[PDB]
């Protein structure tokens, strides 16, 4: 279609919209359930029954409930992010998926509908060890095979976001099938630092299940899509 993601976020295409309300992020860490290997990436799952865990403000018409969050990475530290910024790609990218509780009855239905989801994207960059990320890194050995899952304790995704909350927003799609154009994209300008050793662990996962021949999980990002005549607006100037 015309509203596909990811895209290369370029300065020349950005238009400051001073009308964008403050982005309110409030997650209920207690609603965290398990972490599992989908066969494409690893994803942390939440219990979306809580009407207070989610996001509001910014470009959203109402509150969107947190459902899950995952990551995308490449075979080396030189690439892996889905989105690029003026052509530069980062080692990996974190996606926090929220769904429209107001317009849809549930996440399954939200994910393929008109304004079903709002996804925040955080670029990860090599730097200092990230304390909150370690909690995830430690249980990765338990989910190295496709479809494997491990229970999770309380975890607040906000600990994964950068301090500065300046972003770009635009209409897009899912970056995995069905590639439905149901997403309002919120990408953070400021990348979060993580150490190499933490990033390396992501690469020990496998696309293959138990018994099957070992197929390493790397390069699980979709290639860049054309912006078309979509409005890439920024919350900063």
Annotated binding site for Zn(2+): 70, 72, 95
Query: 197-219: string of b/e by CB count within 10 Å (b at 16+)?
Result: ebbebbbebbbbeeeeeeeebbe
Can you tell me the distance from the alpha carbon of 9 to that of 91, in angstroms, rounded to the nearest whole number? 16
**Do residues 70 and 121 make contact, with C-beta atoms less than 8 angstroms apart?**
no
Rg of the chain over CA atoms, in angstroms? 17
Segment interacting with Zn ion (CB under 5 A) among 90-98, 128-136, 147-155, 197-205: 90-98
Q: Per-residue x/- marks for Zn ion, 94-113, CB under 5 A? A: -x------------------
Q: Please give the Cα distance from 118 to 222 (Å, whole number).
A: 18
44 touches ligand AZM (CB under 6 A): no
Assess 35 for contact with ligand AZM (CB under 6 A). no
CA dihedral (110, 114, 115, 118) positive or negative: positive
- Closest distance between Zn ion and the C-beta of residue 175, in Å? 5
Question: Is there binding between residue 119 and ligand AZM (CB under 6 A)?
Answer: yes
Return the number of the residue (35 or 196) whose C-beta is nearest ligand AZM: 35
- State how far the Cα of 145 lies from the Cα of 212, in Å rounded to an integer: 10
Choices 61-69, 93-101, 184-192, 213-221 (CB under 5 A): range interacting with Zn ion: 93-101
Residue 83 interacts with Zn ion (CB under 5 A)?
A: no
Asked whether position 130 contacts Zn ion by CB under 5 A, the answer is no
175 binds ligand AZM (CB under 6 A): yes
- The SS3 call for residue 45 is strand
Minimum distance of ligand AZM from residue 43's CB (angstroms): 8
Which one, of 55, 88, 93, 102, lies nearest residue 191 by Cα?
Answer: 93
By CB under 6 A, the residues from 56 to 95 that bind ligand AZM are 95
Confirm or reject binding of residue 174 to ligand AZM (CB under 6 A): yes
Element containing residue 166 per DSSP (H, E): none
Min dist CB 18 to Zn ion, Å, is: 29
Residue 111's binding partner out of Zn ion, ligand AZM, none, with CB under 5 to 8 Å set by partner kind: ligand AZM
Residues that bind Zn ion (rule: CB under 5 A) add up to a total of 1
Distance CA 132, CA 137 (A): 9
**Which residues make up the interface to ligand AZM (CB under 6 A)?**
95, 97, 111, 119, 174-176
């Amino acid at each position: 279609g015309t509203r596909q993601s990811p895209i290369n976020i370029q300065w020349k295409d950005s238009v400051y919209d001073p009308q964008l309300a403050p982005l309110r992020v409030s997650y209920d860490a207690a609603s965290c359930r398990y972490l599992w290997n989908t066969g494409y990436f690893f994803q942390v799952e939440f219990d979306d029954s809580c009407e207070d865990s989610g996001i509001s403000g910014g470009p959203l018409g109402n509150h969107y409930r947190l459902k899950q969050f995952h990551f995308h990475w490449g075979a080396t530290d030189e690439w892996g992010s889905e989105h690029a910024v003026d052509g530069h790609t980062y080692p990996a990218e974190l996606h926090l998926v929220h769904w429209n509780s107001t317009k849809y009855e549930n996440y399954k239905k939200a994910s393929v509908g008109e304004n079903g989801l709002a996804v925040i994207g955080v670029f990860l960059k090599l730097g200092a060890h990230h304390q909150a990320l370690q909690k995830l890194v430690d249980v990765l050995p338990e989910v190295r095979h496709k479809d494997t899952q491990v229970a999770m304790g309380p975890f607040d995704p906000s600990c994964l976001m950068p301090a500065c909350r300046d972003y770009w927003t635009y209409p897009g799609s899912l970056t995995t099938p069905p590639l439905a154009e149901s997403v309002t994209w919120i990408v953070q300008k400021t990348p979060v630092e993580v150490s190499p050793s933490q990033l390396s662990m992501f690469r020990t996962l496998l696309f293959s299940g138990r018994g099957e021949e070992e197929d390493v999980m790397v390069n699980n990002y979709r290639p860049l899509q054309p912006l078309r005549d979509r409005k890439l607006r920024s919350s900063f100037r």
